[PDB]
Amino acid sequence: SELSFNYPNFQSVEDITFQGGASPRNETLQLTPTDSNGIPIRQRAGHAVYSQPFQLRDTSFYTTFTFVIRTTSNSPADGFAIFIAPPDFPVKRYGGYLGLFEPNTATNTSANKVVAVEFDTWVNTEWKEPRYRHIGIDVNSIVSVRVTRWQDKDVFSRSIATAHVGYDGISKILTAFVTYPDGGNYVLSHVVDLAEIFPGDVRIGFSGATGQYETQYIHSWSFSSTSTN
């Protein structure tokens, strides 16, 4: 179906739903909470989602957002993701599950219905993932189907980074491009039939989790979808 929105900043959150530890703060979406002293709270997850459902049958979309990772040590955890899931998808487990999975089914593709582009700051030993910080495409599992190295210089840059995520509904391909000002660029794509996974309605949004020593912020976001028919 056709949907468009545009948030150059979050002075308005009219159409954004916050769940778990996420909240609007300083004209941003703050995905995980901080205490009254500004310190990241450990072991929390949060979602900030566009409230209106849409359909993926015969649909292409383009979305872009800007983001900042604020770290308070060289060992931040856990990261954040942009995700698509059914409209009643709740905030799930904190830590390396990124708010998107739970321990007993996190690697079981038959037990999940969620697609995401993750920005992963903490190398988990509890399931397979690369030995370095990474950006990945996840299809129904916390073990990414496509994953690439995310350079530490960019992770810790303090920059406002940009992501572009697109889905071509004819070729059935999800793509992310991530760019840093005067830093790295990242390209990842995967063939996945989203309408097969999600025959009904979905929402798109962000999930963040701690972890420790990290807060994730979304500074702007826009989206457009169009019919392929």
Ligand X SMILES: *[C@H]1O[C@H](CO)[C@H](O)[C@H](O)[C@H]1NC(C)=O
* Residues contributing to the site for ligand X (CB under 6 A): 77-78, 95-97, 122, 124, 126, 211-212
CB closer to ligand X, 126 vs 193: 126
On whether the CB atoms of residues 97 and 208 are closer than 8 A, the answer is no
Distance CA(156)–CA(153), nearest Å, equals: 6
Q: Write the burial class of residue 20 (CB in 10 Å: 0-12 exposed, 13-18 middle, 19+ buried).
A: buried
Binder of residue 214, out of Ca ion, ligand X, none (CB less than 5 to 8 A by kind): none
Kindly tell me which of 94 and 167 has the beta carbon lying closer to Ca ion: 94
Q: According to the annotation, is 229 in a ligand binding site?
A: no
Phi then psi for 154, rounded to 5 degrees? -80, -40
Residues 6+ positions from 14 with CB-CB distance below 8 Å: none
From the CB of 71, what's the least distance to ligand X, in Å? 13
**Residue type, position 123, single letter:** V
Backbone angles phi, psi at 155, to 5 degrees: -50, -50
Identify the burial level of 181 via C-beta atoms within 10 angstroms of its C-beta, where 0-12 means exposed, 13-18 middle and 19 or more buried.
Answer: exposed
Taking CB under 5 A as the criterion, the residue among 64, 124, 189, 226 binding Ca ion is: 124
Q: 196 labelled as ligand-binding? A: no
- The interface with Ca ion within residues 94-113 (CB under 5 A) comprises 96
By DSSP bridging, strand 161-168 and strand 59-71 are antiparallel
Kindly tell me which of 63 and 210 has the beta carbon lying closer to ligand X. 210
We find the least distance from the C-beta atom of residue 47 to ligand X, in angstroms, to be 17
Q: Which of 22, 50, 54, 120 binds Ca ion (CB under 5 A)?
A: 120
Where is the binding site, in residues? 118, 120, 122, 124, 129, 134
Annotated binding site for Mn(2+): 118, 120, 129, 134
Question: What residues line the site for Ca ion (CB under 5 A)?
Answer: 96, 120, 122, 124, 129
